[PDB]
Point group: C11
Chain length 68, copies 11
Amino acid sequence: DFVVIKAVEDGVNVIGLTRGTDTRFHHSEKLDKGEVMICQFTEHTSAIKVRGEALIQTANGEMKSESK
Amino acid sequence: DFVVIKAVEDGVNVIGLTRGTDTRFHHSEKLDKGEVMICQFTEHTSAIKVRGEALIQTANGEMKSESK
Amino acid sequence: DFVVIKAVEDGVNVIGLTRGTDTRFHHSEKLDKGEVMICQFTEHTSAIKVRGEALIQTANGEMKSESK
Amino acid sequence: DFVVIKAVEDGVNVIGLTRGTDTRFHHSEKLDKGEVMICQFTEHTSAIKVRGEALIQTANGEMKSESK
Amino acid sequence: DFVVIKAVEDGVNVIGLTRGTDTRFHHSEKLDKGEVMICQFTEHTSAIKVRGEALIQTANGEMKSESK
Amino acid sequence: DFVVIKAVEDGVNVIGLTRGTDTRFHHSEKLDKGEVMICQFTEHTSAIKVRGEALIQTANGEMKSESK
Amino acid sequence: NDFVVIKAVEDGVNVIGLTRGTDTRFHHSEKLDKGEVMICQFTEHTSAIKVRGEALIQTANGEMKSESK
Amino acid sequence: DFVVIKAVEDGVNVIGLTRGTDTRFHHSEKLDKGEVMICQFTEHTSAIKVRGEALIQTANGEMKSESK
Amino acid sequence: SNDFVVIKAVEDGVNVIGLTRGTDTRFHHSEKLDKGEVMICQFTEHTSAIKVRGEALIQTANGEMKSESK
Amino acid sequence: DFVVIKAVEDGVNVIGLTRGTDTRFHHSEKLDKGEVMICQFTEHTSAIKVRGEALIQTANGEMKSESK
Amino acid sequence: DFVVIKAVEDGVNVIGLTRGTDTRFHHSEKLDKGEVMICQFTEHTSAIKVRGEALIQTANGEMKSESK
Ligand SMILES: N[C@@H](Cc1c[nH]c2ccccc12)C(=O)O
Ligand SMILES: N[C@@H](Cc1c[nH]c2ccccc12)C(=O)O
Ligand SMILES: N[C@@H](Cc1c[nH]c2ccccc12)C(=O)O
Ligand SMILES: N[C@@H](Cc1c[nH]c2ccccc12)C(=O)O
Ligand SMILES: N[C@@H](Cc1c[nH]c2ccccc12)C(=O)O
Ligand SMILES: N[C@@H](Cc1c[nH]c2ccccc12)C(=O)O
Ligand SMILES: N[C@@H](Cc1c[nH]c2ccccc12)C(=O)O
Ligand SMILES: N[C@@H](Cc1c[nH]c2ccccc12)C(=O)O
Ligand SMILES: N[C@@H](Cc1c[nH]c2ccccc12)C(=O)O
Ligand SMILES: N[C@@H](Cc1c[nH]c2ccccc12)C(=O)O
Ligand SMILES: N[C@@H](Cc1c[nH]c2ccccc12)C(=O)O
C-alpha cells in the first residue's frame, strides 16, 4: 500500500514514523508547491504523518490537509 | 490494512493498542487541526482508537469521530 | 480483517473473546461517546462482542448496536 | 471469513461447533437485545448455529433468525 | 467457502458427507424453524446435503430446499 | 470451487467421477424432490455428472438438466 | 483450477479429455445423454477438453454452444 | 488460463506451441463444424495459434478468426 | 497469474516477435500470422517482451489496441 | 505487470532502466509508425522510459507520449 | 505497484528515495516534454518524488504536478 501526496502550498511535510515497539519521527520530507510524493509503507515506516496544505490519495479514497 | 485520519480540529488523539495476549496503549499521536495521519495494523498494533473530532477512512468506508 | 466501532453513547464496551479450544473474555476496551475504535481479529482474538449503543462497520456491511 | 450477529431480542444464542472428525457444540455465547457479535471460522470452529431473533451478515448476503 | 442455511419449517437436516475415498454422512445437524446454520467445507466435509424446507445462501447464489 | 444442485423431482443422481489416470464413477448420491446438495471438487473427484431433473448453480451461473 | 459446465441438448454428446504433457491424445470420452449435465475440471491428467455433439457450455470465459457432426 | 475455441466451419486448426528456448508446434488439433475445444496454457504450451473460421473466448474477451 | 496477449491478423504478413528475458534483449523467434489467424501467447521464462508488426487486432488485460502495416 | 506501447509515428523508442542499486539504460527498442510493443517489468527492468509519439496502456489507464 | 509519469514541460524531475533506515535520493531521472516514464517501487526505491509540471497516474487515480 502507498500514499500519494501533492503539495498545494509551500511548507508541506511528509513525516515517517518508525515501525516496531518504538514510535518516533525518523524522517521528514519537504515538498514545495506543486511537487508530488508517492511513498510506501516499509519495514521501517508503518505510519505516516502529513502537515501543510496538500492533496492526499490512498487506496481508501482522497483526503485533504491544511496548514497552520 | 491501513487507516486514514484527518484532524478536523485540534485535540485529535490517535492511539495504538498492543498486539498479543495483553491489551494496552503503547503510543498516542496527537494531531493539530488539518494534520493527516496514515497508519497500518502491524506486528505491534492490532487495534486502534481515535479520540477527538476527526475524519476517518478505512477499506470498510468512511467514519467521523466526535470529541468531548 | 477488521471491525470499525463508533460509540454513539458513553459506556460502550468492545469485548474480545479468546481463540482456541476455550472461549473467554480477555479484554474490554471502554469507548466514550464519539470515540472510534478500529480493531482486528488476531491470534488471540477470534470473536468480538459489542455491548452498548454504537455504529459498526465490517466488510459485510453496516450494523448498529443498541444499549441494553 | 466471519459472521456478524445482532440480537434483536433477549435470549439469542450463538453456538460454536467443533472442527475435525467430531462435530460437537463446544461453546454457547448468549446475546441480549441490542448486543452485536462478530466471530470468525477458526481451527476449532467450522460450523456455527444461531437460535433466536437476530440479524445476520455474511459475505453471501444477509439473513434473519426467528425466536421461539 | 461456507453455506448459509435457515430452516423455514421444523426438523431440517443439514447432512455432511465425508471427504475421501468413500462417501457417507459423518454427521446430521437438525435445525428448527427460524434457526440458522452456517457451515464450511472442511478436511472432513467435502459435500453437504440439505433435507427439509430451508433457505440457502452460497457464493454462487440463492436456493430453496423443500419440505415433503 | 463447488456445485449446488436442487432436485426438481424424484430420482436425481449426483455422480462423482474419479480424478487421475482412470475415469469411472465412484459414488452416486440419490436426491429426492426438493433436496439440495452442495459438493466440491476434490482429490478424489475432479468431474461431476448430473442425471435427472435438477437446478444447478456454479461460479459460472445456473444450468438445468432434464430426466429420461 | 477452472472447470467446464456442459449440458447435452441432444443425444450422443461426447466430452473428450486430452492428456497433459508432451504427448497430446484422447484418454477418455464421457457420453452424455440428452439433458444430462457434466461439470469437469482441468487436472494433472487433462489439460485440454473436446466437446462433440449439440450442447451448452459454460466457462469462466462466458457461454458457448456446440452442434452435432 | 485457458482458451475456448468453437469451429464455425470445417478446417479449423488449433495449434500448440512449445514453451522454452525453442518455439515450434508440438500438436495440431483438427476441429469440425460445431465442435468446441477448451485448452489451457501448460508446461509444454506457452502460446496457441488458431486457423480457420472459429469463435474464440479468453479472459481478455472474445475474438473471431477467419479461414483462408 | 502469468499474463498473455491475443493477436488477430487483419491482413497477411503479420509478425509476432518474441524478445528474450534477462541481461540481453533480442528476437528469439518470429511467428508469421496471415489474414484471419488468431494467436494467444504468454510471457514466459524466456519471453518477457513482445513486438508486433503488421496490421493486427490486439487484446490484453489493460485494454485493446490496433497495429498497422508498412 | 506489463506495458502496451503503440507507436503513432516513426522514431519511437522504448527504453528499459536497470533494477537494483544502480540505475541506467540497458536497452532501447525502436518502434516505427504502427508497431506495438508489449513488455513486462522484470528482474533487470524496474523502470521504463517512452520517447517519441505513442499510445500507452497500463493497468492504471491510458497515456499518450509526444516527440520532439 | 508502479507509477506513470508524463512530462508536460522539459526538464521534469523524477526522484527515487532509498528504501531502508535512511532516506535520501539515489537517482534523479529527467523527462523532457512529452516523454513518459513508467517505474516501480523496488528493493531500492520505497518512495518517489516528482518535481516539474507532469501528469501522474497510479492505482489510486490521477494527480498533476506543477513547477516553479
Ligand atoms: N527510507 C524510507 C522511505 C519512506 C517510505 N515511506 C515514507 C514515509 C515518510 C518518510 C519516509 C518514507 C523507508 O523505506 O521506509
Ligand atoms: N510503532 C508503531 C507505529 C504505529 C502504526 N500504526 C499505529 C497506530 C497508532 C499508533 C501507532 C501506530 C507500529 O509500527 O506498530
Ligand atoms: N491485544 C489484542 C487487541 C485486540 C484486537 N482486537 C480486539 C477486539 C476486542 C478487544 C481487544 C482486541 C489482540 O491482539 O487481540
Ligand atoms: N475460542 C473459539 C471462539 C469462537 C470463534 N468463533 C465462534 C463462533 C461461535 C462460538 C465460539 C466461537 C475459537 O477461536 O474458535
Ligand atoms: N466436524 C465437522 C463439522 C462441520 C463443518 N461443516 C459442516 C457441514 C455439515 C455437517 C457438519 C459440518 C467439520 O469440521 O467438518
Ligand atoms: N467422498 C467424496 C465426496 C464428494 C464430493 N463431491 C462429490 C461429488 C459427487 C459425488 C461425491 C462427492 C469426495 O471427497 O470426493
Ligand atoms: N479422470 C479425469 C476426469 C476428468 C477431468 N476433466 C475431464 C475432461 C474430460 C474427460 C475426463 C475428465 C481426470 O482427472 O483428468
Ligand atoms: N499435451 C498438451 C495438450 C494441450 C494443452 N493445450 C493445448 C493447446 C494446443 C494444442 C495442444 C494443447 C499440453 O498440455 O500442453
Ligand atoms: N517458446 C516460446 C513461445 C512463446 C511464447 N510467447 C511468445 C511470443 C513470441 C514468440 C514466441 C513466444 C516461449 O516459451 O517463450
Ligand atoms: N531483457 C529484458 C527485456 C525487457 C523486458 N521489458 C522491457 C522493457 C524495456 C526494454 C527491455 C525490456 C528483460 O528481461 O528485462
Ligand atoms: N534501479 C532503480 C530503478 C528505479 C525504479 N523505480 C524508480 C523510480 C525513480 C528512480 C529510479 C527508479 C530501482 O530498481 O529501484
